[PDB]
């Protein structure tokens, strides 16, 4: 029943400092370990370096040894990773993973994301996708929502408040001129559309822009 | 410096220091009981000091954190997890009584915060007359009885210091440790050790009608040759260094999890054991005995000592503070300070109950805490109002449970885990190296010894203590053996939801 | 350190038969006759997820398909039979010297029988037209294998610039792939024209998908 969680996204420019908070749930927390580990998107995870909860008493792996100061909070059951002297090569997404006492690593975090850049945040636009007019119906009908011009990484989209889950595609955000973009697919029967109405549900944390878009016919 | 020292000497000072081990000497007939701890100490207590650092981070280092799992990676065998169950039932069994005498301390401090402190009988001059009052006011606290009536009466204030004591430890289990941990244990644990000092400078000076505190030293340090050949001594001498040393509880297994395989602990550990051993033999040792003798005169000594476990602080403490400078107040410092000592060593055996349940059967932090604090606080009431019956548990618990269990972990760690294999666990990182003649005591002599003073013990005591009927303790044998059924039926539990994914 | 090199970098394997993923190690992972080498589930979006410790030990909540093998240097994460939702990349680690060092990862795909997508096209939106921009839309949903072609037909003429495009990931379930092609022009360029066309290229069909609208 133990769950680590994490602060969130986070941007920052080049040379600046962080520091990210991994609060611990439901368990004795001076009893276990923490580790941090850094994985690129593309990468394999590469271990920071980990902490000892009950006597602090960091451990950084070499590579990340003036990078990375490993610092605990005993009274909120917390544990934070300080990042200094950031690039672009730091941005990645961070883990903190408990193994038992330190099998290694049985549980995680959900992770963190920083972004190291000068880039301004800029809130998403989202373009509901309807059907061309007078599109033939089939069985089934497919719609969409575009997700465009926002910065930084990342967006969460779901459908109907996350309702309807089932044969719904999210692509992958691309980065063309400092602004990300992506699209996500929705696939219902065509008694279902207009029928019953489906809703896009975007939220960027980063700009705090919560934004629903209802589908309609052309 | 001075810093860097009164923090060292604070680190141990347990209530088994004062309030536990004078009563264990005290009844055991001092010195006779001296000769036979100070051996327990060199071929018993600082082998298993090391013994128990060694399997906690080993345990660590895999992460098991209690020893029915860590017995049972040192040993696959399903009688190995229930040999592990003493080291769940000692700490908690302990713990039921060990948070009453916690709660003793808080209403001694309360009182003497308030000035309500027994004085002398003015003009008395008599040993019994002035033992009276002093007794009075610990059997008027908690209530003992007349005529060994079954039922304890403990005054309201006593219950209602109970109640806020639980409440506390319980509020401390539940939020963590900020405000009053490092900033206030690394202001009390000095404190406490400068008082210390200064009673048992205080008290040699000590020399009245009835006796000379010099006369209690001497007594103390006496060997009697008569009491050697008695077994129940060579137990309570054991029992008390594992009790004093933490050593027979899981929680110094469990605390040991955090420290790295590549630590020392050689060093460390046996600085820790010997710190403890000057603490309380120099000062615990060296205060209330002594204070007895010379006040009390020896006969009344050993009669208060034997009357029950923990008891003989509660008066003799109370009898030094009156007439000396600043009593009352020195009393309510030193009471105050006791009972924070006794707090950070409650919590500390209530780990190993929680640590199990949230490792195994998956339990939260708050489900661990509170069915434990529950276990604690229901399972009390019959230690406050059973006669007999915390003495009884001190005795199965914190007396024999540890010598057996110890006798189990070192025959796990050192015989079927591995003679060399453990040597080498214990070896890594440390300081300096392993005197070689302890590979020998350990694997030899330390057994051999444990394994013939259990058995001497029995049949000695075990037919005497089927002739006790107090009608009281019985309730508590067979509760007491419940509450191990039960243990081992949560580890059963705990199998049985592994084993059914 | 102790490196670790993993086997074949990527896997593709066929329902209901055998995974055989490896590690090997510059030292050896054993201490006390112990392999200290873990393995990691981790699908995209997620944390890893722990599958086997000590090798040869099955962690609970994980299926027995996954079963754990090897020692000294040479180890063997076996998974049969293999399962939809195993799709992911695989770890190894190693934790017998410390500082700890983990594999570069094996990506495990299904093979799924070939597949056509189904092809939609969207026209800009509306309110994305007052903004000044005009994006056409192409899904390609369902299909394998992963590779495809797009080619976006304005007027008839085949238009190279401003297309972006985004490959999902191989679906847990059905084991196939999706694609987003995005045409961005501006709203003068694109009332300039009328017919805008999205042509797919599989290999499940010589003759190409064609998905179009009338700009009107």
Known sequence: QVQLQQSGTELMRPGASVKISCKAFGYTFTNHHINWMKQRPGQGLDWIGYIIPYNDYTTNNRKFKGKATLTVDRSSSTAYMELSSLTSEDSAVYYCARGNYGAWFAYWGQGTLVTVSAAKTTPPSVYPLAPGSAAQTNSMVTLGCLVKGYFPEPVTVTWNSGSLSSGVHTFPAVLQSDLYTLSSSVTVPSSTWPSETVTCNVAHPASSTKVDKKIVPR | RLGLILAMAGNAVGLGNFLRFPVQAAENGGGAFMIPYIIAFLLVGIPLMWIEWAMGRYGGAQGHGTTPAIFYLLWRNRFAKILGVFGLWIPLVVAIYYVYIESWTLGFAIKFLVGLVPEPPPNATDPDSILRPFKEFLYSYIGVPKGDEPILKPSLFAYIVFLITMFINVSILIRGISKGIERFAKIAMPTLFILAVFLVIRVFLLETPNGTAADGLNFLWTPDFEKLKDPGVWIAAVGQIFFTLSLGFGAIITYASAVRKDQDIVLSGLTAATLNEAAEVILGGSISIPAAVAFFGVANAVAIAKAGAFNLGFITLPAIFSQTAGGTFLGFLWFFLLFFAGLVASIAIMQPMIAFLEDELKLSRKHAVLWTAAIVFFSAHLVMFLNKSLDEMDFWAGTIGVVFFGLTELIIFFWIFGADKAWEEINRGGIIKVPRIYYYVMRYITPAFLAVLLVVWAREYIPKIMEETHWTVWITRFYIIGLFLFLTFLVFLAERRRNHE | ?216
């Not at chain 3, 992911?88 to 990506?107: H, I, M, R, V, W």
């Open chain 3, 1 to 216: 350190d102790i490196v670790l090199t993993q086997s074949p970098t990527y896997l593709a394997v066929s329902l209901g038969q055998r995974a055989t993923i490896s590690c090997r190690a510059s030292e050896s992972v054993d201490t006390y006759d112990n392999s200290f080498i873990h393995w990691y589930q981790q699908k995209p979006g997620q944390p890893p997820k722990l599958l086997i410790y000590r090798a040869s030990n099955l962690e609970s909540g994980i299926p027995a398909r996954f079963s754990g093998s090897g020692s000294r240097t040479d180890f063997t994460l076996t998974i049969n039979p293999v399962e939809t939702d195993d799709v992911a990349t695989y770890y190894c680690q190693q934790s017998n010297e410390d500082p700890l060092t983990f594999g570069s990862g094996t990506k495990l795909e299904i093979k799924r029988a070939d597949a056509a997508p189904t092809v939609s096209i969207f026209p800009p939106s509306s309110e994305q037209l007052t903004s000044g921009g005009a994006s056409v839309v192409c899904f390609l949903n369902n299909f394998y294998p992963k590779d495809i072609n797009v080619k976006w037909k304005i007027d008839g003429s085949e238009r190279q610039n401003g297309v972006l495009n985004s490959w999902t990931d191989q679906d847990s379930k059905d084991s196939t792939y999706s694609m987003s092609s995005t045409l961005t022009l501006t709203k003068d360029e694109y009332e300039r024209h009328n017919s805008y066309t999205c042509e797919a290229t599989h290999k499940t069909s010589t003759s190409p998908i064609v998905k179009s609208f009338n700009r009107n």
